[PDB]
Amino acid sequence: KECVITGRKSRSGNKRSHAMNSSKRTWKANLQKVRILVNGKPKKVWVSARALKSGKVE
Amino acid sequence: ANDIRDLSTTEIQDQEKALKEELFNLRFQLATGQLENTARIREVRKAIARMKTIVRERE
Amino acid sequence: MHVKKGDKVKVITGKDKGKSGKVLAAFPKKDRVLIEGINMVKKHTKPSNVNPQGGILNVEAPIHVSNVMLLDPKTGEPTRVGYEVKGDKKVRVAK
Amino acid sequence: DARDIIKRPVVTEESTSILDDKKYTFEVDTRATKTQVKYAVEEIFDVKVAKVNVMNYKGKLKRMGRYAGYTNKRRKAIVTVTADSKEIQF
Amino acid sequence: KRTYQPSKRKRKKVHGFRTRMSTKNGRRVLASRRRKGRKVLS
RNA sequence: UAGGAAGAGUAGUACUGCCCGUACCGCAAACCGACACAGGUAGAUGAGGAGAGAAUCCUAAGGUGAGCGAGAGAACUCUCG
RNA sequence: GGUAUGAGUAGCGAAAGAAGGGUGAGAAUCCCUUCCACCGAAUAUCUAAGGUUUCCUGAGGAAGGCUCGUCCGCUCAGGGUUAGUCGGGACCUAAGCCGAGGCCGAUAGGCGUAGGCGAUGGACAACAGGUAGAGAUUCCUGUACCAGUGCUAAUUGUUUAAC
RNA sequence: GAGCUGUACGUAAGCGUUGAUCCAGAGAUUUCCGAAUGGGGGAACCCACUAUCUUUAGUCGGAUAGUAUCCUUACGUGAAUACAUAGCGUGAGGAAGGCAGACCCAGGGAACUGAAACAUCUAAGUACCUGGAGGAAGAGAAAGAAAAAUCGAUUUCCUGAGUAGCGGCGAGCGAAACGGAAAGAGCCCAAACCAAGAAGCUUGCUUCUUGGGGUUGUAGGACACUCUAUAUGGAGUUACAAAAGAAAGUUAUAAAUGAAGCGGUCUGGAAAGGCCCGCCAAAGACGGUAACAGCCCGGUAGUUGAAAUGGCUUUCCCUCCAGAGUGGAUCCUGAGUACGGCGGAACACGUGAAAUUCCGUCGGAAUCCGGGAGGACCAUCUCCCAAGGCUAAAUACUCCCUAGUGACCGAUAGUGAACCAGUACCGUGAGGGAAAGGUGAAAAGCACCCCGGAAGGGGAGUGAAACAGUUCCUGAAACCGUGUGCCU
Ligand SMILES: [Mg+2]
Ligand SMILES: [Mg+2]
Ligand SMILES: [Mg+2]
Ligand SMILES: [Mg+2]
Ligand SMILES: [Mg+2]
Ligand SMILES: [Mg+2]
Ligand SMILES: [Mg+2]
Ligand SMILES: [Mg+2]
Ligand SMILES: [Mg+2]
Ligand SMILES: [Mg+2]
Ligand SMILES: [Mg+2]
Ligand SMILES: [Mg+2]
Ligand SMILES: [Mg+2]
Ligand SMILES: [Mg+2]
Ligand SMILES: [Mg+2]
Ligand SMILES: [Mg+2]
Ligand SMILES: [Mg+2]
Ligand SMILES: [Mg+2]
Ligand SMILES: [Mg+2]
Ligand SMILES: [Mg+2]
Ligand SMILES: [Mg+2]
Ligand SMILES: [Mg+2]
Ligand SMILES: [Mg+2]
Ligand SMILES: [Mg+2]
Ligand SMILES: [Mg+2]
Ligand SMILES: [Mg+2]
Ligand SMILES: [Mg+2]
Ligand SMILES: [Mg+2]
Ligand SMILES: [Mg+2]
Ligand SMILES: [Mg+2]
Ligand SMILES: [Mg+2]
Ligand SMILES: [Mg+2]
Ligand SMILES: [Mg+2]
Ligand SMILES: [Mg+2]
Ligand SMILES: [Mg+2]
Ligand SMILES: [Mg+2]
Ligand SMILES: [Mg+2]
Ligand SMILES: [Mg+2]
């Protein structure tokens, strides 16, 4: 579950209350399942919205 | 050992068979309590090993 | 070891110092030697063994090698041993 | 080879009691099938084998001064030769 | 009726060598018993 | 049926048939209970008289006399009349 | 860790023994005989599990055995388990488990398709006698069955096609 | 270079100067399980298929080889579907697993505890799990540190300094630069542009591959001219391109040689000790030997030595290679990047006035008249040129090997383990986890007699000693007894 173009994926960090209690959470990448052809043949792969912004296959 | 190297492979192969037949008979006599010279067994085993070593060297 | 079976040794330490004998056996793993007529012990032997009348047998027991010196047939005295090569094999030499 | 498969004869009151019945008891290689034993015995002794019965003996636990361990596992083959077949000697 | 009702099969299926090897944590156990130098893994 | 096919069956004859288990205990002193432990341990079989019966009492086949004993016959305790 | 005290005390774990004979250095306790007594839908006979040599024979009596011990499930030696047909595998699948690709997921992995594994179930050919220190539907005798194989003999088939 | 067939208390049969046993280098053999890989499996088992050979009258047997999965990559076949793709097959390469319970980098990440309670904070980015490794890793040739006016990659140590700071401004946390040292080393791309294809056909323009070129700040390069090189020189497998060999030296892995007292005498079981004489010493290390040895033995100093294998160092081979100057028409100099908002994290720095660095998300430059930093921010000045990569040494650690050391332990200590110990034993399992060293110099390990079934004793003998008798140096105390001087 990772951007095939970039490598964007889940990363951990803290959620913080007011009062500054911390608890672990993640930041997921905005991955979208799309058909592209990294290799000649097309295929449905995870790609980040950020990677799609501009010039990709679709 | 050097005398073994004088022989042909086929001739060595025949010497092995002869030694294996001898070793079998020794073990058979040993089992039936008829051997006496029990030191022959080790001699023959070594000889067989010597044959098979020379032959593997040939290749 | 500086001596071996057959050697004529003088004994330089123990109840038997001054006595000489022939080396009947060497035990290089124990670093001991068996000298003829030296270190006699009385073995209380049961009949069972090769000895069909048993009895108190008087035989030689082994001495420590460092307690005997080699006898040079020329001088007939205890000598330390050197090693000199003739050509083929090396040989013991007196000093 | 055949003399690998047949290890040694078995000499016991039981083994010796059935020699007259033309049944010969051998200790055979632990991997040897009774078919391999049949053809080995025929090669070695020049006899016609009627049947081979075979049994596995597990190792027997033996002590020797606070050291304990198992004797070798054995495979025992009883080889019955035919009426017409020549005997094995022992 | 006591705990411990022996079964040859259940012993090997739950604790045997191949069951230990079949999981990563099972392999940690084998590695740990080898490290301690146990005569008997599994 | 699709397929594959010159060999097929029938009779007779003799030959061939591997590996693992097989001992012994198994209501038990051998299994599970630290014990030669009044406990626990699936299934098959489980005779006769009287009886509905595998109940009950006495027996058959078969198995057993239980790994401390000899006296004594007080209090008391337990189990009984 | 050793050794006391309690103390020669509690206990010796459900139960019927007896005498004669034997063995032996030694006998309530081992062997034999006879009588007595107990279980008998079991305390009998098989057998699965489990145990793993405890089985048989010959020696033994330190320790173990709640006493004793000449005896033993104990010690030491030798021995002992035989299968085409019994049970399991070279057959089958259930629950369940694994699972090529696949799907999912910080890592590790989780799930799952084909496909496999997996009896507690399905399928599948041997009986009666004998023998015995220790195995027996396994050994032996007799009489079988199942699946194959070659070898004889006829028989039929050899491209509208036996099988 | 004379014995040997391991322990260990055997019996037997044998071997060895025609050189054994033994030591070192190199080979061969190396069952089964295990990633385990032909399929399966309850590890150490079961069951195959395909070739080739072998056996039998044929089944039945035997031998050898191949046969996992994934990735990459050739080639071939090849659907819905016409081309084709997927799929399927074959052949090459490669991976897989383990571990030094260490060190290193990354992903994920506690709590007890401290704060005399506790929530921010601490513990701590610790323990632990997972992945990746390497002999080290990481870092690294400035969009740096500064502002004594200059320095010149990184890392590590000393110092700065418990300073500046951070902080329920609590508990606590806590730098950096300068200065001094160890060690030192620098390089390659991307892009302009050139050539050659290849394709798209935008059809003479554009983007794709290979090669050349080119690597940087008051700029460098391309591009114009110009001078010299095209192996003259130079450089290499530790970056800077990458594989190969030789030879010589040296080190390692066995060994060899090696001085001087049987000196006298005393005690003693024994002399290495005492007393009295000598001697060697580049050797008076250590150990052994019947008590304490430079001169008895193994040795030690010194001096020699290697058939074989491995390491290292050189040299040769082999391989590879353009580098100065002058202009500044134009062109190039890393884009979903830098940066910003929002949410987190890392920075000693807890969102703060919060620079710097990273992550998610959304927005989103300039691009030489350009860009970044100097702790909000602007201006000036100064120093730098990001969004690509590589790079030894100084540093960390030790499962190991070799040689040594210790005002370290000496059997309840020291390892859990001096001894067949991760054993026995306990536990379904993960896991937990002991106890236990000493005869003597030498077995000379008690012939023989006596009591006893034996055990065990008493003699006799061995021995310095047996009150050293096969667990046997010493042998305290508790505790158990016998005897009896005084008392009851
Ligand atoms: Mg069988
Ligand atoms: Mg248990
Ligand atoms: Mg039976
Ligand atoms: Mg019971
Ligand atoms: Mg019940
Ligand atoms: Mg009866
Ligand atoms: Mg009392
Ligand atoms: Mg009382
Ligand atoms: Mg009482
Ligand atoms: Mg009782
Ligand atoms: Mg009843
Ligand atoms: Mg018995
Ligand atoms: Mg007793
Ligand atoms: Mg007995
Ligand atoms: Mg199912
Ligand atoms: Mg299925
Ligand atoms: Mg199955
Ligand atoms: Mg029986
Ligand atoms: Mg039969
Ligand atoms: Mg030699
Ligand atoms: Mg396999
Ligand atoms: Mg507190
Ligand atoms: Mg000397
Ligand atoms: Mg004297
Ligand atoms: Mg002394
Ligand atoms: Mg000494
Ligand atoms: Mg932020
Ligand atoms: Mg912070
Ligand atoms: Mg700024
Ligand atoms: Mg952002
Ligand atoms: Mg900035
Ligand atoms: Mg400022
Ligand atoms: Mg500041
Ligand atoms: Mg730049
Ligand atoms: Mg200790
Ligand atoms: Mg002590
Ligand atoms: Mg300890
Ligand atoms: Mg003692």
Swiss-Prot record, chain A:
What terms describe the molecular function in GO for this protein? structural constituent of ribosome
Q: Is Ribosomal protein set as a keyword in this record?
A: yes
Q: Basic residues composition bias: which ranges?
A: 8-18
What InterPro entries would the database entry show?
Bacterial_rp_bL28, Ribosomal_bL28, Ribosomal_bL28/bL31-like_sf, Ribosomal_bL28_bact-type, Ribosomal_bL28_sf
Any one GO BP annotation for this protein: translation
| Region of interest called Disordered, as start-end residue ranges on this chain | 1-25
Q: Which UniProt keywords apply?
A: Ribonucleoprotein, Ribosomal protein
Q: Which GO terms describe its cellular component?
A: ribonucleoprotein complex; ribosome
Q: Which Gene3D superfamilies match?
A: Ribosomal protein L28/L24
Please state which protein family the record places this protein in: Belongs to the bacterial ribosomal protein bL28 family.
What HAMAP family does the entry give? Ribosomal_bL28
PANTHER family from the UniProt entry: 50S RIBOSOMAL PROTEIN L28, LARGE RIBOSOMAL SUBUNIT PROTEIN BL28A
Q: What is this protein called?
A: Large ribosomal subunit protein bL28
What organism, scientifically named, is this protein from? Listeria monocytogenes serovar 1/2a (strain ATCC BAA-679 / EGD-e)
Its taxonomic path starts at: Bacteria, Bacillati, Bacillota, Bacilli, Bacillales
Swiss-Prot record, chain B:
Keyword Heme in the entry? The reply is no
* Entry's Gene Ontology cellular component terms: cytosolic large ribosomal subunit
Print the keywords alphabetically: Ribonucleoprotein, Ribosomal protein
What domain of life is recorded for the organism?
Bacteria
Alphabetically, the GO molecular function entries are: structural constituent of ribosome
GO BP, sorted A to Z: translation
Matches recorded under InterPro entries: Ribosomal_protein_uL29, Ribosomal_uL29, Ribosomal_uL29_CS, Ribosomal_uL29_sf
Q: Which NCBIfam families match?
A: L29
Please state which protein family the record places this protein in.
Belongs to the universal ribosomal protein uL29 family.
> What's the protein name?
Large ribosomal subunit protein uL29
UniProt organism field: Listeria monocytogenes serovar 1/2a (strain ATCC BAA-679 / EGD-e)
List the lineage, top down.
Bacteria, Bacillati, Bacillota, Bacilli, Bacillales
Q: Which gene encodes it?
A: rpmC
Curated annotation (Swiss-Prot), chain D:
A single GO molecular function, which one? rRNA binding
Q: Which InterPro entries match?
A: Nucleotide-bd_a/b_plait_sf (IPR012677), Ribosomal_uL23-like (IPR013025), Ribosomal_uL23/eL15/eS24_sf (IPR012678)
Q: Which UniProt keywords apply?
A: Ribonucleoprotein, Ribosomal protein, RNA-binding, rRNA-binding
A Gene Ontology cellular component where this protein is annotated is:
cytosolic large ribosomal subunit
Lineage, top-rank taxon, reads: Bacteria
**What Gene3D superfamilies does the record point to?**
3.30.70.330
Q: Which GO terms describe its biological process?
A: translation
- Disulfide-linked positions: none
Q: What family does the entry list? A: Belongs to the universal ribosomal protein uL23 family.
The record's function comment reads: One of the early assembly proteins it binds 23S rRNA. One of the proteins that surrounds the polypeptide exit tunnel on the outside of the ribosome. Forms the main docking site for trigger factor binding to the ribosome.
**Known partners and oligomeric status:** Part of the 50S ribosomal subunit. Contacts protein L29, and trigger factor when it is bound to the ribosome.
Q: What is this protein called?
A: Large ribosomal subunit protein uL23
Organism expressing this protein natively: Listeria monocytogenes serovar 1/2a (strain ATCC BAA-679 / EGD-e)
Q: Which gene encodes it?
A: rplW
UniProtKB/Swiss-Prot annotation, chain E:
Question: Keywords, A to Z?
Answer: Ribonucleoprotein, Ribosomal protein
What InterPro entries has UniProt attached to this entry? Answer: Ribosomal_bL34, Ribosomal_bL34_CS
The segment annotated Disordered runs over: 1-42
Pfam families listed in its UniProt record: Ribosomal_L34
User: Which biological process terms from the Gene Ontology are attached to this UniProt entry?
Assistant: translation
Which residues are in coiled coils? none
| One Gene Ontology term of the molecular function aspect | structural constituent of ribosome
An example Gene Ontology CC term for this record: ribonucleoprotein complex
Keyword Ribonucleoprotein tagged: yes
Locate the compositionally biased regions of type Basic residues. Answer: 1-18, 25-42
In the record, the note on similarity to other proteins reads: Belongs to the bacterial ribosomal protein bL34 family.
> NCBIfam families under this entry?
rpmH_bact
Please report the name of this protein according to its UniProt entry. Large ribosomal subunit protein bL34
Q: Which organism is it from?
A: Listeria monocytogenes serovar 1/2a (strain ATCC BAA-679 / EGD-e)
